[PDB]
Structures are given as C-alpha cells and as structure tokens.
Design a protein around this ligand. Structure first.
Ligand SMILES: Cc1cc2nc3c(=O)[nH]c(=O)nc-3n(C[C@H](O)[C@H](O)[C@H](O)COP(=O)(O)O)c2cc1C
Ligand code: SF4
Ligand code: SF4
Ligand code: SF4
Ligand code: FES
Ligand code: FES
Ligand code: NA
Lengths: 441, 100, 62, 206, 214
C-alpha cells in the first residue's frame, strides 16, 4: 500500500480508551512536570533515533496515522506537513506552533502547557525535522502568562540537557525554540493572522494563496500547527502510526481531548477516544447533566463557531468529524457546552454573536460590519422586540457572510445563528409573541 | 475640430464612458451676462458633441463636411502589469508592505 | 547538574514556602509549584538566560 | 512564458501565468466591480466586492487577488456572483451616513454608481429605528484635505498610497471591528507634495 | 468608553518622560535578538508589553520609545498598540480585575460575580477607582472555561468563584494581603471534582509499546 494509507478501522465500539492508550499521561498534573519527571515518563526517549530516520520516513508515519489537525479545521496533517517538505527554495524554514486558545469553551491547550511542556518541545523537534525547519516559534495567548513562563522554564531545561540548540539530541540537526507572547486577540489564532502578528504587523489575516507553505513568517515557508497536533507527533513515531489508526473510525483516527463545560455536574477535561457516542462520554467522566439527561436542552459540540444541536439529535450523535457533519454541525475544537433546560438559549447564543463582534479584525467587509448587524438583531430577539418575519432575514444575512470573508472567523460567526434558527425557531417566535402582549397590553 | 477620446474621470474606476471617440469644437469666448450674471456666448457649435467608433471614421466624417480637424494621439494600450499578491510579504525584497 | 531551572530570580518562591495556590506542592497531589510561583517579570527575565544556548540566526540583509 | 487558457463567461482567453482574474476579464472587456483594488497600489482584499464565481469551487474567489489557473471557467454574470455583490452592497451601505446631498463626491461616487449597477434596490436595515447607524469622529489632516471619516468604507486605498507612493507612513488603521478607524492617532498634518492624490483615490467622500 | 484617538491629558502626553530601566534595558537586547536580522519589528508586541509592565499602563511617550528602538514611523506602533486589547492606553491603577462573561462562564453564574464586584468596590464596568487600585473590566474568554466561573487579577486565575468566595478575595486585596490563586472548589486543576476516573494507573514509563523499528 502507498505510504498515505491508514489501516481501515475494524472495530464497532469506541468507548473504553484503556489507560495505557492515553497520550497525555500527565494531563491532571499529578506527577512531576520537570525533565526528571517527564524522563521517567519517557518523553525524550529515542528522540535521536527518530530524527535520523529521515523526514520522509516521519511523514509517512503521520499519513499512516491518519492524524487530522486538532486546531479546528481538521485538515489532514500528513499532507499539511508535506507541502513544506518540498525542496524549492534557499530561504530559512520555520515551524510556528499555535498555542493560542481563544475559542470559548476550550481549555485543552492550557493543559498541554502546564503539565507536559516537554512533550510539546519534544514534538517541535520531530515535526521540525519533518519540515526541515531551522527553528520553531511558540505563539501563546497574552492572558496565559504563567503558562508562558512555565513553558519558558521547560525550554531552558531542554537547552541545558542538550536536547535542542546546537546538535539537538545529538542528531547533528540545529534547532532553536522560541516563545512569542502575543497580546490579547482572539483573531490571532488564525494561521495567516498568526503569521502577521509574528511579523509585528497589526495582525489581520492574509489571503490564500499564497499559502503559508510558500510565504509565511518574514516571507519564508512555514507550517502553522496546533499544540495537540504537535504534542502527539512524537508518540506517533514511538508507538507506530498503525497503533494510532487503531482508534477512531476509519477516516477519523486518534484520541481527542474533550473540555466538557456547561451545565454539567462535574465539568472537567478528559482524553477520550474520538467517535465515542456523546451520551457515553457525558455520563462516564462528568457525572451527567445537572438535572439528569432529561433536562438537556442541546449542546455546542465544538465551542463557539459550531451550530447548536437540540436534545433529540444528542441521543444518537457520534463525537467525530464525519459523525457530526451528518448532524449539520462540526466537531471544531471538541469542547462541549452542555445546556440545561433552565437556560435562555436565545441569550446564550446572543452572547456568542457579541463575542465575535468583539473579535472581528475588521479587515474585510462582511465580518467587519455584517456581524455588527446580527448583533443588533439578536439583541432585539432577546427582548422579543422584533417582528416574526425578521427570522428569515437573520437566516438570510448569515448566508451572505458565509464564504465571502477572508478568514474563517466570518464563517464561524454565521454557524451559531443558523443552528439557533434551524432548531429553536419556535422558541424565538414565542418570545416575540409574548413581547406583543406585554407591550400591547 | 478636435478628435479625441473623452478623458476618464480620475475620481472613479469605471471606464465604459471612454469607449468612444468624440469631436468637440474650439472653446470660443464666453462672458458674464450684464443683467443677471449668467454665462453668455454667441457660439452655437461650442455646444456640440458627436460619437464615433474609430478615428478613421471621425476623420472621414470631418472631411465630408469641410471642417478642419486634428486628432489627439490615441492612448497606447496599457502595458501589462503583474500585480501579484504574494510579493507584499517578501523575505529580502523592498516590496514588503509595512501596513495592512 | 546540567539541567538547572531558570534562575531563581524568575521563580517566586525561591524555591519552597510550603503549599501554595490551590494546594499545589512539591510532593502534594498537584506537583507543579512553578505555575503559581512566577514573578511579574518572570517571562522577560527568562529570556536573558537563554541567549547563551540560542545559536546564530538568519539575515534578510543585503 | 506560454499563455494559459481560461474562459470568462465561456469565452476563451490567453493570459500569461500569474495574471489575476480581474485582469484576465479586463482583456475581454468585462469590468468586475471593485473598491479596494487599484491598479497602481498593492493588492488588498478588504472590500470583497470583486467576488466572482468559479466553476467547481467551494466558494467565491476574490477576483482582484486570485491568480488565474489553467482551465477555469470564471462566471461573472451568474446568479451566485450577482447575489454576492448584492450582499456586500447591502453590507457596505448600512453605516454610510446618508449624506449624498451634502457630499462632494455625489454624482461622482463609486459607492453610488456601483450600488445602482449591482446592489439591491431595497434596504433591510430595520435597526435604524432602534440603535441607529455608526458615527465616527472627524480628523484634522490639514489645510488641503477635508476629512469626514463617517463616510469611510475602510478600503485602505489612502493608507496603501501614503505608505507606498508618497512613502510618508503617517496614515494608518487603528482599532478593530466596527470601531476601526483610518487616520493619525495623534493629530498631525499629512504634509507631502503628493498629498492631493489621496483625494482622488478615496472612492467615497471621506 | 475607550477611544482610538489620543487627546492631550496631564496623565498622558508625549512630553512625559519614560525610559526602560537599566534592568529592563538588558531584557530589550535579549528580545531583539530573537527575530531575523532584517525583520526586527516583530519585537514590537514584546516591547510594548514589556513597557506597560514597567508602568502599569501604556502612555504615548512609551509608544515613541519603542519606535525609536526599532527605527520606525511612530504610527506603525500606534496601529499595533491599538489593535490588541490588553494594552491599556489609559491609566489602570494596580489591580485590573478581568471577569470573563461569555458562555460557558455565563452559564455557570458569571453575572453574579460581576454584580458583586461593582457593589463591593462601587465602580462601573471598564472603570477605575479613586485611588487607582482597582479597575474592574469585563473580558471575553480567558481560556479557563472548564473551571468557570473565573476571574483574573493582573496575571492570575481565580477559578470556580461565587458571591461568597469572591468577596473574600476583594476583602483580602483591599487589605493589601496576597491571596491564594487557582481554583477554589477543592479541585487542583481541571480535574473532575471528587474521585478521579482517568490516569489513576501509574504512567507506564519509557519504551513501552515501541515500534521496535526505532
Ligand atoms: C478566527 C479563528 C481563530 C482560530 N483560533 C485557533 C486557536 O486558538 N488554536 C488552534 O489550534 N487553531 C485555531 N484556528 C484554526 C487555525 O486557523 C488552523 O486551522 C490551525 O491552527 C492549524 O493547525 P491544525 O492542523 O491543528 O488545525 C482559528 C481559526 C480562526 C478562523
Ligand atoms: S472575517 Fe472578520 S476577522 Fe476574518 S479577515 Fe474578515 S474582518 Fe477580519
Ligand atoms: S460617499 Fe456616501 S454620502 Fe458621498 S455621494 Fe457616495 S454614497 Fe453618498
Ligand atoms: S478614508 Fe477613503 S481611501 Fe481611506 S480607507 Fe476610508 S474610504 Fe478608503
Ligand atoms: S477589489 Fe477585490 S476585495 Fe476589494
Ligand atoms: S468562557 Fe470564561 S474562560 Fe472561557
Ligand atoms: Na474622494
């Protein structure tokens, strides 16, 4: 079989995720996160030997792994790491790890940087050789200050142990890792917008093409990759790509982090096999919805920029890329936001629309001020001060913003309203109808 | 008589109003009107304007009516311009934009 | 020891002051005192340390 | 190099590789609407008015910035392209300040002319009666250029010109979202022998 | 009420003097030596951030100093300093209370925390106190959604707050006495409260389940 052929899945249940199969063994910070602690977990083990296999060998493992990006787009990593492997230029090459964690409801990236920073630094090297990058930049939120220092502490340890820098891991490969604390801006988690911030410009997303693999930071080839993607990169090499392909459905291999926030009894972050049924997830680690499963009103599968799904759909959903697309919704960042029945769904969504309005970079016309329109519309819906015909208009405005913007933030801001109108339209109409009686009477 | 293409409006980007050749006569005298101060003139042809498809037709029309004519140089077709986007983000070249 | 931590100027506790934060401790259930024990200039101070180990780096100049 | 073949509205064209869709359609004689693209300024994709359909593609592609690829069938006057332009006009004209009678650009305004040619005739902006439109403070740029920033459509022609042609780098963009504004942060004079040319680039009366 | 236009004020005018301390000056050299030789304006965000930490908030006289370091037009700094949100261009004081208010912090009772903060300090959102010690200010999402509701104070994350435990913090801070940060609801960090469910088994250790092909 060609190198890019993950083994077909052959399981019919994806629920356990045995403990030894967990990737991030120090997720809850129950052990020493230092180099001695991580070494006892084998984080920097055989890193020389993996690197000297060859970049081409490393990539074919990743395609065999069938690892799709955890950042939120989900584009297969294998190809993504192969575009930058083309030897066409004599310019430097960079690997920008996107540690931004802007999307609401998502805390997973914070875990990987407090208690396993060395796993990320380790992953930079293996990915670094695959791309052949001269150095790697870690872009971290401005608000994550302590995590940045914590991450900085791990990097300094790596340098003194000889793992990175000149003769990284004794491979003869020269690699330097840098941290770049970007200031507070949700938009900076976008590939091209991230590249612009590192250049020191305002930080507005660029157009594609040219893609980052051609011009990136400082106009040089780059590969912007999320931390979870990188942090899993070495453990794929150690434990085989085929092993990872064992989990998850046929085209949706791999384990995933699920930040289950919202009205749940025991909100937490838990690594779990992807393609697990959602019900089995909520009632296995988080102790169920507050008022039992019957009080569920719908969840947001991927944090904001994911259409809500009502209770009935949740009965049989599969937490997976393909599985959720069937439900007219996208997995996104895997963050779940449960919502009890005693929740003003209109006011919940209206918050997210206000969130995007506060985060649009303003560069391109639809999202600059098209979102400003929906924010005004949704505010009046919350009060019920609107005519029922406005519902179809609000549906209409969303179609105009989708696909006409530069970055995917605009597409993100349109999905929540489409999910709202498509499932809870009767509730919106009732709010208006009440507003008619109280104001008229 | 001046055969010419009407000049494009610098304050706009549309062009379909310069897709013709034209004739406009000399710009003879005007003066303030003694009573109300309007503009006055004794120049009937000064008001005039006709459209054509090419200067050859325009010259042909002018000769057939005895007018004296002279043609403004036809604007040469604009040279090709590259207008690439990626060069705005260049590694060692000066084309790199400091704004966005 | 070769793997020395960032200089204690960048670590608040310098290095132990009993349990800190929500219960994080050296030998407690949550073994990461560093996260809760950084100076307000910790990140910047660390940068001065790593200059020694960071190798030369490219130039776009002419 | 060798001319690439591309069809705009099903009419074959020959273009050197790297040509933009907007330029390729110019050869036929088709003028796609534009606000941010200017022929003598760096390419930007802010306005999204130049959006155009391409056969078998997931979404519209900005004509000004898309480099033509062989075999494409661009569709300028299609239903999808028409809807795209209508959407953006309906979007650009929300917060424009309703000043045409007192605006110098009137009768010479790109936002007017392109609204007639492509935009819709109605206005769906019901929210005039609840929260009103946006209004932005004015700027004192100097004795030559009057400035009414509430009419700006953020095309960034002014910013690109002053940075690229005049090379002054005193004008720029501040803020984000709707509260974005173009102009000096601290009141200054935009002093340059070429200062006048800004007045011609700004397609609206800002 | 934040404005993206600078107006002359006694607290904020360019004629105010500002300079990097001798300690901080050595950090600038470290920062500038991190980006390629020809592209050093990527240090602008680190430098601007390093400026306000030395000053609490970011005056215009600071903005020029950064430009002088990088040899840029003054406005290229203004654009960047005005885009990102945590650059406080007006005086903030000492404590800048960062209260998340978006979903799911809103779902887990965030409005109460915001209300109590205003009442206890008697100020409005996005505003400072007379002594310039507190400055309540809503924020959008601090990425601690799991441990919601949560508040942040100038670097820290006080997660799992309520009306009671929050006023404990304000009572401490008003007393000038440091307080413990981190989650308040008997959870160390992002763990499911109570008995654990995963990772209870020991980490296997190095070399387990290797490819055996190196
Ligand atoms: C508005 C916006 C914000 C984004 N924020 C993040 C983020 O915070 N972290 C992340 O990993 N990807 C984020 N992305 C997705 C990135 O564009 C990109 O898909 C990802 O970083 C690439 O790495 P991946 O292969 O792991 O997905 C964002 C995209 C958009 C449009
Ligand atoms: S969609 Fe919004 S955030 Fe993205 S480029 Fe356009 S204006 Fe900026
Ligand atoms: S710039 Fe605006 S106000 Fe002025 S003429 Fe054009 S549309 Fe009317
Ligand atoms: S002021 Fe005029 S030229 Fe400048 S961005 Fe606004 S509309 Fe465009
Ligand atoms: S002309 Fe293409 S986006 Fe403006
Ligand atoms: S919603 Fe409050 S930290 Fe994310
Ligand atoms: Na103008």
């Amino acid at each position: 079989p060609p190198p890019g052929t993950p083994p077909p899945q052959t399981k019919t249940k994806f629920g356990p995720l045995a403990d030894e199969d967990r990737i991030f063994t120090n997720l809850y910070g129950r052990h020493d996160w230092r180099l001695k602690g991580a070494l006892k977990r084998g984080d920097w083990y055989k890193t020389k030997e993996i690197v000297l296999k060859g970049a081409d060998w490393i990539v074919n493992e990743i395609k065999t792994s069938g690892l799709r990006g955890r950042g939120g787009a989900g584009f297969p990593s294998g190809m993504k790491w192969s575009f930058m492997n083309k030897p066409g230029d004599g310019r430097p090459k960079y690997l920008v790890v996107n540690a931004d964690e802007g999307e609401p409801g998502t805390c997973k990236d914070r875990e990987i940087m407090r208690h396993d920073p060395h796993k990320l630094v380790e992953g930079c090297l293996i990915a670094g050789r695959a791309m052949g990058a001269q150095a790697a930049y870690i872009y971290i939120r401005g608000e994550f200050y302590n995590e940045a220092s914590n991450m900085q502490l791990a990097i300094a340890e790596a340098y003194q142990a000889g793992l990175i820098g000149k003769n990284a891991c004794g491979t003869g490969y020269d690699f330097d890792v840098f941290m770049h604390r970007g200031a507070g801006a949700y938009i900076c988690g976008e590939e091209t917008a991230l590249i612009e911030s590192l250049e020191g410009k305002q930080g507005k997303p660029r157009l594609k093409p040219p893609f980052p693999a051609d011009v990136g930071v400082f106009g040089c080839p780059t590969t912007v990759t999320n931390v979870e993607t990188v942090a899993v990169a070495p453990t794929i090499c150690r434990r085989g790509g085929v092993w990872f392909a064992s989990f998850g459905r046929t085209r949706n291999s791999g384990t995933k982090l699920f930040n289950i926030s919202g009205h749940v009894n025991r909100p937490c972050t838990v690594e779990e096999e992807m393609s697990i049924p959602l019900k089995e997830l909520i009632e296995r680690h988080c102790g169920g919805v507050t008022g039992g499963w019957d009080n569920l009103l719908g969840v947001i599968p991927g944090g904001s920029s994911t259409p809500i799904i009502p209770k009935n759909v949740c009965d049989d959903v599969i937490m997976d890329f393909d599985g959720l697309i069937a439900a007219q919704t996208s997995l996104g960042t895997a963050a779940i936001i449960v919502m009890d029945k005693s929740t003003d769904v209109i006011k919940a969504i209206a918050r997210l629309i206000s969130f995007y309005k506060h985060e649009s970079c303003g560069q391109c016309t639809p999202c600059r001020e098209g979102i400003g329109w929906m924010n005004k519309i949704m505010t009046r819906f919350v009060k019920g001060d609107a005519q029922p015909a406005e519902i179809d208009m609000l549906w209409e405005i969303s179609k105009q913003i989708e696909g006409h913007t530069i970055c995917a933030l605009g597409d993100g801001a349109a999905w929540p309203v489409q999910g709202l109108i498509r499932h809870f339209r009767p509730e919106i109409e009732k709010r208006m109808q009440l507003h008619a009686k109280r104001v008229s009477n | 008589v001046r055969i010419h293409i009407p000049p494009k409006n610098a304050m706009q980007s549309g062009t379909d109003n310069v897709n013709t050749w034209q004739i406009e006569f000399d710009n003879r005298e005007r003066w303030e009107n003694p009573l109300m101060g309007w503009a006055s003139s004794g120049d009937p042809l000064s008001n005039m304007n006709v459209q054509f498809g090419s200067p050859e037709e325009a010259i042909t029309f002018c000769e057939r009516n005895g007018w004296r004519w002279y043609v403004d140089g036809a604007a040469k077709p604009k040279k090709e311009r590259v207008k690439n986007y990626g060069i705005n983000f260049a590694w060692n070249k000066r084309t790199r934009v400091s704004t966005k | 020891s070769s793997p020395s931590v960032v200089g204690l100027t960048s670590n608040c506790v310098k290095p132990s002051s009993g349990p800190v934060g929500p219960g994080a401790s050296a030998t407690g259930g949550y073994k990461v005192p560093e996260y809760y024990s950084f100076n307000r200039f910790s990140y910047a101070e660390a940068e001065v340390e790593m200059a020694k180990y960071r190798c030369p780096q490219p130039s776009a100049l002419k | 190099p060798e001319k690439i073949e591309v069809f705009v509205d099903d009419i074959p064209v020959q273009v050197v590789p790297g040509t933009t869709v907007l330029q390729a359609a110019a050869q036929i004689g088709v003028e796609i609407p534009r606000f941010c693209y200017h022929e003598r300024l760096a390419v930007a994709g802010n306005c999204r008015m130049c959006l155009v359909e391409v056969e078998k593609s997931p979404k519209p592609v900005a004509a000004c910035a898309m480099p033509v690829m062989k075999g494409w069938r661009i569709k300028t006057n299609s239903d999808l392209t028409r809807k795209a332009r209508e959407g953006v006009m309906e979007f650009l004209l929300m917060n424009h300040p309703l000043d045409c009678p007192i605006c110098d650009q009137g009768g010479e305004c790109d936002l007017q002319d392109q609204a007639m040619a492509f935009g819709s005739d109605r206005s769906r902006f019901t929210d005039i009666n609840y929260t009103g439109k946006r209004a932005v403070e004015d700027k004192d740029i100097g004795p030559l250029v009057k400035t009414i920033m509430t009419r700006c459509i953020h095309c960034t022609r002014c910013v690109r010109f002053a940075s690229e042609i005049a090379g002054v780098d005193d004008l720029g963009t501040t803020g984000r979202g709707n509260d974005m504004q173009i102009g000096t942060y601290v009141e200054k004079l935009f002093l340059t022998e070429l200062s006048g040319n800004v007045i011609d680039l700004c397609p609206v009366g800002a | 009420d934040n404005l993206f236009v600078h107006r002359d004020t006694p607290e904020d005018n360019p004629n105010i003097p500002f300079e990097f301390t001798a300690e901080n000056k050595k950090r600038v050299e470290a920062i500038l030596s991190i980006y390629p030789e020809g592209h050093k304006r990527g240090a602008m965000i680190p430098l601007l951030d390093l400026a306000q930490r030395q000053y609490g908030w970011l005056p215009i006289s600071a903005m020029h100093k950064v430009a002088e370091i990088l040899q840029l037009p003054n406005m290229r700094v203004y654009e960047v300093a005005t885009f990102y949100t945590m650059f406080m261009r007006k005086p903030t004081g000492k404590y800048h209370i960062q209260v998340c208010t978006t979903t799911p912090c809103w779902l887990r009772g965030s409005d109460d925390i915001l209300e109590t903060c205003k009442k206890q300090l008697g100020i409005g959102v996005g505003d400072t106190t007379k002594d310039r010690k507190f400055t309540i200010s809503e924020v959008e999402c601090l990425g601690a959604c799991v441990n919601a509701p949560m508040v942040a104070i100038n670097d820290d994350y006080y997660e799992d707050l309520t009306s009671k435990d929050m006023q404990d913090i304000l009572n401490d801070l008003k007393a000038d006495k440091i307080s413990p940060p981190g989650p308040r609801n008997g959870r160390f960090a992002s763990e499911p409260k109570g008995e654990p469910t995963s990772l209870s088994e020991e980490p296997k250790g190095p070399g387990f389940g290797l490819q055996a092909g190196l």
